[PDB]
């Protein structure tokens, strides 16, 4: 019921007393959440009055298709997103098949929120934090079976030459336990941070069974804490992958890396290098780099790359229960389980 296969343990809105609602538009989602804060007497209840299961049936393909055709006109528009602020009764936002959104989900100071089967893409407002999914000061969040996409490209003359599009899954603050699973993330320059700054360290996050394709960096950009990445398929990484910083620890197991530049590294700070424990990935030694097109580059400040493909530290005993399939099975099967319209199907060895 509360098993996500990672550090997050939540059933979201699928609990006792849950109220099911259908949202046909972004504004409905907003109105529905607002109504869920009132008690039988019409007075607001801190954290929400009752649990919710919102089924989003909206479709914004027209907005998405128009944006895909004019990539550079997106960054300067107003950002669009539904905010889930201080809602702790339990909430699940699940898209209907055929559903789509050109707006993001921004979670702040909440807990026990699950967002599933949502196809989100080409969001406007990259220069004003137009994230697809943001988890801020929010423990027990599960982002599962979603398709997050844009174009892995940077337009000219954008603020900081970094704002053509914002991130897919940014995690920051006290979001102590989070699970990011079965997502199909493609065409994204900045996938997601795990800590917004050098001081924003900590958290225990699990990234499992995600399919990354044509992404530039931040898988994630980790600042301290623990990150467990297993059964992910990493292909066409154009910049860097898992960047473990501020003495963070990562357990990188049974993943498949292919056509990736700097898949596992610790760079951009020049100090306080993170560590990684590598085991069961398709790459087992430097000899495999050529086999899978793994390239390494240096940085202008002191850095550490896993070009020796050896463990550089340790990792505490993994709390939860999980059963990873082989890296080969991920490569062969994952694409059919990750994303939307897969009916939240999970990959087990039985299917390998």
CB of 286 to Ca ion, least distance (A): 35
Task: Kindly state the number of chain residues that form the binding site for Ca ion, as judged by CB under 5 A.
Answer: 5
Q: Preceding residues of all breaks in the chain (C to N beyond 2.5 angstroms)?
A: none
Nearer residue to Ca ion within complex by CB, 167 or 235: 167
Q: Is 269 annotated as a binding residue?
A: no
Q: How far apart are the first and last CA of the chain?
A: 25
Which string of x and - marks every residue 115-154 that binds Ca ion (by CB under 5 A)? --------------x-x-----------------------
Based on the shown chain and the rule CB under 5 A, indicate whether residue 83 belongs to the binding site for Ca ion: no
The encoded tokens of residue 88 equal 């702790």
CA-wise closest residue to 266 among 224, 220, 305: 305
- Supply the DSSP string of 281-334, one letter for each residue: SS--STTHHHHTTEE----SS--EE-TT----S------S------HHHHHHHG
Given a contact cutoff of 8 angstroms between Cβ atoms, the answer to whether 203 and 175 are in contact is yes
Which string of x and - marks every residue 313-342 that binds Ca ion (by CB under 5 A)? ------------------------------
- Supply the DSSP string of 8-39, one letter for each residue: ----TT-STT-EEEEESSHHHHHHHHHHTTB-
> Is residue 119 annotated as part of the catalytic site, yes or no?
no
Tokens 């398929």, residue located: 233
Residues with Cβ within 8 Å of residue 252, at least 6 apart in sequence: 229, 230, 242, 264, 276, 277, 278, 279, 281
Q: Is 129 annotated as a binding residue?
A: yes
The encoded tokens of residue 11 equal 């059933």
Nearer residue to Ca ion within complex by CB, 147 or 166: 166
Nearer residue to Ca ion within complex by CB, 166 or 200: 166
CB of 170 to Ca ion, least distance (A): 4
Nearer residue to Ca ion within complex by CB, 41 or 78: 78
CB of 172 to Ca ion, least distance (A): 8
Tell me which of 119, 203, 218, 267 is the catalytic residue: 218
Q: Is 350 helix (H, G, I), strand (E, B) or coil?
A: helix
Nearer residue to Ca ion within complex by CB, 129 or 137: 129
CA-wise closest residue to 267 among 289, 300, 237: 300
CB of 147 to Ca ion, least distance (A): 19
- What residues numbered 148-187 form the site for Ca ion, per CB under 5 A? 166-167, 170
- Supply the DSSP string of 56-87, one letter for each residue: E----HHHHHHHHH-GGGSTTSPP-EEEEESB
Supply the residues annotated as catalytic.
218
Residues binding Ca ion (CB under 5 A): 129, 131, 166-167, 170
Annotated binding site for Ca(2+): 129, 131, 166, 170
């Amino acid at each position: 019921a509360t098993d996500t296969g990672g550090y997050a343990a939540t059933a979201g809105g699928n609990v006792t007393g849950a109220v099911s609602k259908t949202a046909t538009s972004m504004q409905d989602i907003v109105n529905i959440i607002d109504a869920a804060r009132l008690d039988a007497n019409g007075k607001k209840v801190k954290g929400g009055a009752y649990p919710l299961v919102i089924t989003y049936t909206g479709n914004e393909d027209s907005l998405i298709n128009a944006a895909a055709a004019n990539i550079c006109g997106q960054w300067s528009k107003d950002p669009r997103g539904v905010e889930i602020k201080e809602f702790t009764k339990g909430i699940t936002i699940i898209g209907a098949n055929g559903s789509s959104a050109n707006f993001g989900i921004w979670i702040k100071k909440s807990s026990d929120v699950v967002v599933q089967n949502m196809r989100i893409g080409y969001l406007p407002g990259g220069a004003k934090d137009g994230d697809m999914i943001r988890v801020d000061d929010s423990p027990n969040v599960w982002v599962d079976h979603n398709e997050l996409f844009a174009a892995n490209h940077e337009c000219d003359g954008t603020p900081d030459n970094d704002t053509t599009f914002e991130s897919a899954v940014d995690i920051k603050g006290a979001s102590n336990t989070v699970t990011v699973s079965y997502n199909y993330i493609h065409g994204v320059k900045k996938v997601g941070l795990d800590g917004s700054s050098s001081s924003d360290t900590g958290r225990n996050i699990t990234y499992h069974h995600n399919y990354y394709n044509d992404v530039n960096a931040r898988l994630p950009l980790q600042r301290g804490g623990l990150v467990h990445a297993y059964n992910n398929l990493y292909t066409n990484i154009t910049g860097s992958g898992l960047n473990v910083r501020q003495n963070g620890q990562a357990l990188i197991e049974n993943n498949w890396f292919e056509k990736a530049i700097n898949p596992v590294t610790s760079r951009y700070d020049g100090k306080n290098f993170g560590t990684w424990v590598l085991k069961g990935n398709n790459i087992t030694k430097p000899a495999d780099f050529s086999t899978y097109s793994i390239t390494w580059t240096a940085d202008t400040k002191p850095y550490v790359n896993a070009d020796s493909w050896t463990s550089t530290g340790t990792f505490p005993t993994v709390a939860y229960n999980y059963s990873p399939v082989s890296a080969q099975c991920v490569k062969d099967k994952l694409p059919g389980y990750a994303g939307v319209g897969k009916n939240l199907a999970t990959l087990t060895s039985t299917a390998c």
